[PDB]
Design an enzyme around this catalytic site. Structure first.
Site, PDB file in Angstrom:
ATOM      1  N   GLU A 118      11.605   6.426 -44.320  1.00  0.00           N
ATOM      2  CA  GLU A 118      10.509   5.923 -43.520  1.00  0.00           C
ATOM      3  C   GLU A 118      10.594   6.578 -42.144  1.00  0.00           C
ATOM      4  O   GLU A 118      11.672   6.650 -41.579  1.00  0.00           O
ATOM      5  CB  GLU A 118      10.610   4.405 -43.424  1.00  0.00           C
ATOM      6  CG  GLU A 118       9.520   3.797 -42.551  1.00  0.00           C
ATOM      7  CD  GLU A 118       9.644   2.292 -42.375  1.00  0.00           C
ATOM      8  OE1 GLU A 118      10.772   1.755 -42.523  1.00  0.00           O
ATOM      9  OE2 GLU A 118       8.596   1.660 -42.083  1.00  0.00           O
ATOM     10  N   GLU A 202       2.778  -4.046 -35.414  1.00  0.00           N
ATOM     11  CA  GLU A 202       3.611  -5.105 -35.949  1.00  0.00           C
ATOM     12  C   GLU A 202       3.721  -6.191 -34.893  1.00  0.00           C
ATOM     13  O   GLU A 202       4.434  -6.018 -33.903  1.00  0.00           O
ATOM     14  CB  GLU A 202       5.023  -4.593 -36.242  1.00  0.00           C
ATOM     15  CG  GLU A 202       5.073  -3.560 -37.354  1.00  0.00           C
ATOM     16  CD  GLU A 202       6.483  -3.202 -37.797  1.00  0.00           C
ATOM     17  OE1 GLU A 202       7.272  -2.682 -36.965  1.00  0.00           O
ATOM     18  OE2 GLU A 202       6.786  -3.451 -38.987  1.00  0.00           O
TER      19      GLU A 202
END
Length: 223
Positions: A118, A202
């Protein structure tokens, strides 16, 4: 001008998608909707508004625009990933990041929501939150200085490049971050397919706040 308010409400455009993606809603109390302004073949313009409380350490969601129109290739075979993000956050008194999220896998049919690797690029960080892992380096990429964070486990390693002060008007090539990972951290570019490319936020706690993304674009160009 569409409204995505359900946990997994999404829009699928010809090139870009938009996702409310309240994946961690069970983790707290609040509410979040994501709004399409417009989507074209050139870009997508959207915003998301949220208020979240409870479990300060748990991400509540990752509303994002997503590049749908690209071929999955080995990172080593990608010539460039030009991207631009122009955004603002109306209330900074929150715990949240504003971040690119990308995944790679050796398996081209891997679920696109995780990978062997990631790569996150935090354009903005509000509140004393930190990426997965620890900071392992500093790098100059795309004309900015980044903290370089790394961690995870065998099933997923995450590199996070973190901007100190928010980059609300960003243009760069994501391949340069991959190059950094390849040249300096041994990332196996030639055996990892790029399987996902998103940009969003987020939230942990705070709000109401609105992230406005007046313009987002990405493409994945072969040589």
């Amino acid at each position: 001008s569409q409204s995505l308010c359900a946990q997994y409400a999404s829009y699928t455009g010809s090139t870009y998608g938009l996702n409310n993606n309240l994946w961690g809603e069970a983790s707290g109390s609040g509410s979040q909707c994501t709004y399409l302004n417009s989507a074209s073949s050139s870009s997508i313009n959207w915003y998301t508004t949220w208020t979240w409380s409870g479990n300060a350490n748990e991400v509540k969601s990752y509303a994002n625009s997503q590049l749908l129109s690209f071929t999955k290739k080995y990172v080593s075979n990608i010539g460039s990933i030009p991207t631009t993000a122009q955004w603002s956050l109306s209330n900074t008194g929150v715990n949240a990041d504003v971040a690119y999220d990308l995944f790679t896998s050796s398996n081209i049919n891997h679920v696109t929501y995780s990978g062997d690797y990631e790569l996150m690029i935090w354009l903005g960080r509000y509140g004393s939150i930190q990426p997965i892992g620890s900071q392992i380096a500093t790098a100059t990429i795309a004309g900015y200085t980044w903290e370089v964070w790394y961690g995870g486990s065998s099933s997923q390693w995450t590199y996070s490049y973190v901007a100190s002060s928010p980059i609300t008007s960003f243009s760069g090539d994501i391949i340069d971050f991959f190059h950094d990972m390849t040249n300096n951290h041994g990332f196996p570019a030639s055996s990892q397919y790029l399987i996902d490319l998103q940009f969003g936020t987020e939230p942990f706690t705070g709000g109401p706040t609105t992230l406005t993304v007046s313009s987002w674009s990405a493409s994945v160009n072969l040589d």
